[PDB]
Amino acid sequence: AMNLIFLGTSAGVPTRTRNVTAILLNLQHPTQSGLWLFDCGEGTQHQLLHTAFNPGKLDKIFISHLHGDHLFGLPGLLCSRSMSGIIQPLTIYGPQGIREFVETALRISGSWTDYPLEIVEIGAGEILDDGLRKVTAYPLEHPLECYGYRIEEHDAPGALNAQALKAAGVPPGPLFQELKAGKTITLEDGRQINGADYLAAPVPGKALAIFGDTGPCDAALDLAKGVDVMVHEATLDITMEAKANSRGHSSTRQAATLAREAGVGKLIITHVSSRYDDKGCQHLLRECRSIFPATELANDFTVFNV
Amino acid sequence: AMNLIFLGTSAGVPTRTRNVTAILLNLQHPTQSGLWLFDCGEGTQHQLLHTAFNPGKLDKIFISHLHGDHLFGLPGLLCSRSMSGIIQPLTIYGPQGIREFVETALRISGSWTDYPLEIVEIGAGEILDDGLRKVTAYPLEHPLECYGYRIEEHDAPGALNAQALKAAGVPPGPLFQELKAGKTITLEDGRQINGADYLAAPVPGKALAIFGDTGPCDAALDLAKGVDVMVHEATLDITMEAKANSRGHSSTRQAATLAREAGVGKLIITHVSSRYDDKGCQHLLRECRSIFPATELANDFTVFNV
Ligand SMILES: [Zn+2]
Ligand SMILES: [Zn+2]
Ligand SMILES: [Zn+2]
Ligand SMILES: [Zn+2]
Numbered sequence: 001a002m003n004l005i006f007l008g009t010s011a012g013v014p015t016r017t018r019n020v021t022a023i024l025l026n027l028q029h030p031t032q033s034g035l036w037l038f039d040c041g042e043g044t045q046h047q048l049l050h051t052a053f054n055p056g057k058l059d060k061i062f063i064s065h066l067h068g069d070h071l072f073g074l075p076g077l078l079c080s081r082s083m084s085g086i087i088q089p090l091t092i093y094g095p096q097g098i099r100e101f102v103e104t105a106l107r108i109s110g111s112w113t114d115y116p117l118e119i120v121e122i123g124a125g126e127i128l129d130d131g132l133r134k135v136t137a138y139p140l141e142h143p144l145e146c147y148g149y150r151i152e153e154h155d156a157p158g159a160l161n162a163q164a165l166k167a168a169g170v171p172p173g174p175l176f177q178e179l180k181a182g183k184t185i186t187l188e189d190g191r192q193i194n195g196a197d198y199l200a201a202p203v204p205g206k207a208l209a210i211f212g213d214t215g216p217c218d219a220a221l222d223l224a225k226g227v228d229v230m231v232h233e234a235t236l237d238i239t240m241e242a243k244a245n246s247r248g249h250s251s252t253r254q255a256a257t258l259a260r261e262a263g264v265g266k267l268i269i270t271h272v273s274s275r276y277d278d279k280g281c282q283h284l285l286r287e288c289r290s291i292f293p294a295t296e297l298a299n300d301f302t303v304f305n306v
Numbered sequence: 307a308m309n310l311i312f313l314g315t316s317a318g319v320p321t322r323t324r325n326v327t328a329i330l331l332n333l334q335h336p337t338q339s340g341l342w343l344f345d346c347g348e349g350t351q352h353q354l355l356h357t358a359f360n361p362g363k364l365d366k367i368f369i370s371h372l373h374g375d376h377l378f379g380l381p382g383l384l385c386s387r388s389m390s391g392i393i394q395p396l397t398i399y400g401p402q403g404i405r406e407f408v409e410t411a412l413r414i415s416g417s418w419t420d421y422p423l424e425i426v427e428i429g430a431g432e433i434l435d436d437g438l439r440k441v442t443a444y445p446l447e448h449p450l451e452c453y454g455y456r457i458e459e460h461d462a463p464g465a466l467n468a469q470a471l472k473a474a475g476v477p478p479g480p481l482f483q484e485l486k487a488g489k490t491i492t493l494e495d496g497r498q499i500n501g502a503d504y505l506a507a508p509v510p511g512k513a514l515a516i517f518g519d520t521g522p523c524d525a526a527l528d529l530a531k532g533v534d535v536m537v538h539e540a541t542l543d544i545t546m547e548a549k550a551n552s553r554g555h556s557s558t559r560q561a562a563t564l565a566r567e568a569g570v571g572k573l574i575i576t577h578v579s580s581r582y583d584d585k586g587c588q589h590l591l592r593e594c595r596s597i598f599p600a601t602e603l604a605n606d607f608t609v610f611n612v
Contacts, residue, residue, distance in 0.1 A: 013386045014352050042382035043349050046320050068385045068415045076348035076378040080319045097414045104410045108403045109374045110450045144416045 002306035006298045007047040009270040011235045019043045020069040037061045038210045040074040063094030064212025065146035075105035082113045089116040095145040141217035142248030148211040148223040158202035215245045224262030229306045234269035252287035259292045267295040308612035312604045313353040315576040317541045325349045326375040343367045344516045346380040369400030370518025371452035381411035388419045395422040401451040447523035448554030454517040454529040464508035521551045530568030535612045540575035558593035565598045573601040
């Protein structure tokens with residue numbers, strides 16, 4: 001369950017090596033094994049096309065903000081989806097204007113969809129409840145209304161300790177069913193056993209925070225708070241922190257420090273400036289690591305376990 | 307002077323091997339050495355970025371029609387142009403709606419340009435006169451208003467035959483200047499020489515026809531008429547001619563036959579269906595060739611001399 005597949009990792013504009021923003025979320029569930037997409041910069045559909053993922057599995061698309069490097073690319077994807085035989089329904093979630101944009105693009109281009117498409121203009125707060133996980137939007141600091149997304153899968157109820165029960169005399173099968181239900185079923189050995197003393201340790205869910213572009217901000221800490229994996233931009237190095245901050249971006253240290261401040265398992269930085277070359281990106285990594293060793297650099301097509 | 311650089315050659319949707327439509331026209335002139343772009347499907351700017359062409363030289367963009375596979379990609383290019391330091395002015399020519407599309411995209415995405423941008427809603431007829439060449443729009447048969455573009459460079463006035471003059475006694479230099487002007491300057495050898503009898507054979511210009519998507523149509527022959535190079539779609543093979551024609555497309559034979567009918571030097575087919583693989587595209591080529599041997603298959607990044 002839960003995989004991140006980076007399609008684009010470049011700030012603002014594409015480069016020979018990194019395409020603009022798009023992050024894929026593979027949700028491997030027993031009955032919810034679908035695909036989710038966070039952002040859609042130009043070329044996203046191309047990027048996808050080169051992977052073996054089934055474009056049909058993708059059912060939801062979450063846009064953080066409407067800047068070209070996170071949005072242009074969506075109209076083409078929608079048309080390509082339809083031109084394939086995909087008919088599985090699709091839902092887009094994003095800030096106001098998202099609907100006007102998509103509609104206009106489709107209108108003028110003489111396009112449609114042969115699959116039901118639902119566009120949802122969102123705002124801060126819970127966005128949806130899978131029944132298995134919930135997504136929550138958090139407002140960030142950026143030139144355009146921009147949301148971060150916290151994806152949390154509800155905690156799994158603690159399961160019965162089969163071994164402990166077997167140890168206690170309860171045989172597998174018959175009264176096993178009942179003890180499962182909760183019944184305080186008594187044993188032929190003259191002894192009552194309350195299944196509630198064996199349904200131990202209810203495993204907590206995995207927590208993921210995919211941020212939208214942002215400079216330091218209040219809500220930032222909430223989104224991050226103890227999440228397993230935190231995806232955060234690191235557009236510029238420390239010496240450019242002011243430049244970054246002025247445009248709604250964060251510096252290497254700012255991201256790492258927030259990681260630390262929020263006690264998150266792993267930090268994945270992206271949206272790196274086209275100004276830095278491969279080595280420059282390793283220098284960015286070092287900056288983050290020397291303030292939070294558990295940081296990694298995303299790359300086009302790089303994968304991550306939540 | 308005059309080069310075609312194909313950026314995308316795929317019908318409707320991108321593929322692992324061919325991107326959607328975009329054709330580059332390199333105009334190498336003594337004082338007009340700029341770049342021209344015909345169509346802008348998604349990924350066009352990416353495609354460009356991988357070539358050594360100076361994106362700054364590009365000053366004009368011609369859109370045949372507004373279908374996504376010829377249009378999405380334009381907004382991203384404009385933003386990237388501006389994000390570089392490009393300031394050289396840019397002009398877009400295309401059917402109605404082109405302006406509304408570009409503007410809306412830029413508005414919603416919170417973008418601008420730091421270079422003057424001129425959008426021009428066109429219709430049939432001459433589009434511009436370079437002074438060196440003229441571009442003319444021709445209406446075609448397709449689900450959306452779609453124009454073909456004839457680019458003709460005016461004929462070069464015949465130059466003076468230096469040799470013939472030297473043969474006739476006229477020395478290089480002095481009276482050479484005058485004979486150039488037209489003066490019937492007389493020679494010391496007692497003899498008048500009218501420069502008009504030496505300014506021989508006025509070389510005709512090169513003629514290029516970049517078609518937009520189309521099924522057979524009346525105007526098609528005009529656009530094509532004797533042009534040096536004819537770029538025409540060949541979306542489907544002969545056995546699919548009806549399917550093709552029903553959607554505003556042409557079959558292999560239809561394109562070749564029009565080539566022949568119009569007496570054009572070379573035929574370059576593109577906008578091939580993602581349905582055909584490499585071999586299938588060679589089968590498409592054969593079809594064209596057996597009705598007009600001078601046909602070639604465009605490929606992403608393939609170049610052509612007009
Ligand atoms: Zn961005
Ligand atoms: Zn942004
Ligand atoms: Zn087309
Ligand atoms: Zn079309």
